[PDB]
Amino acid sequence: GHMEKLHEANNELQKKRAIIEDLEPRFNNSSLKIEELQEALRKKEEEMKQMEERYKKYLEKAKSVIRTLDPKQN
Amino acid sequence: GHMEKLHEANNELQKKRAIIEDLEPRFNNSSLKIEELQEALRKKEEEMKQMEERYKKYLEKAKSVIRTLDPKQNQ
């Protein structure tokens, strides 16, 4: 047949059309997601570096409170 | 005539085939990516939980000291 091969071809085109319309919004969503997961990851890793700044500075501060309050040197 | 319609259709098929063949591995990679990231991020919110627990620890030693040396508690 010839008429019958046009039918098989047009239907497969409708099939691929449906495959594409379903997968595209999915792939777009998942792209957005990867971006926000990395802004969260970056923003968290920054918080962690600050958190280490503070505890570090705290320990150094208490190092000098010890000197100030020690009688054996003051 | 009919020749041309079956040629236009078969070549549109190869177009859509190319679209799909290119997007599908991309979408698979990105599904794996989302879950690798979400893992890294929860291993990181954990590391943070430990570090805030450690800093809150130290911040309550510190006010313990601010209270004992409070002039008002020494009179």
Residue numbers in the entry:
A (entry chain A): 550 to 623
B (entry chain B): 550 to 624
Lines quoted from the article behind this entry:
Hook microtubule tethering protein 3 (Hook3), a cargo adaptor protein that serves as a crucial scaffold protein linking cargo to microtubule motors, plays a pivotal role in regulating bidirectional early endosome trafficking, managing directional movement, and maintaining Golgi morphology. Among these domains, the Hook domain together with the first and second coiled coils serve as the dynein-binding region, whereas the third coiled coil-containing the carboxyl-terminal region interacts with several proteins, including fused toes homolog (FTS), FTS−Hook−FHIP1B (FHF) complex subunit Hook interacting protein 1B (FHIP1B), and kinesin family member 1 C (KIF1C). KIF1C, a kinesin-3 family member with plus-end-directed motility, mediates the anterograde (plus-end-directed) transport of vesicles containing several components, such as α5β1 integrin, 14-3-3, and protein tyrosine phosphatase non-receptor type 21 (PTPN21). A previous study showed that KIF1C exists as an autoinhibited homodimer, and becomes activated by interacting with the carboxyl-terminal region of Hook3 or the FERM domain of PTPN21.
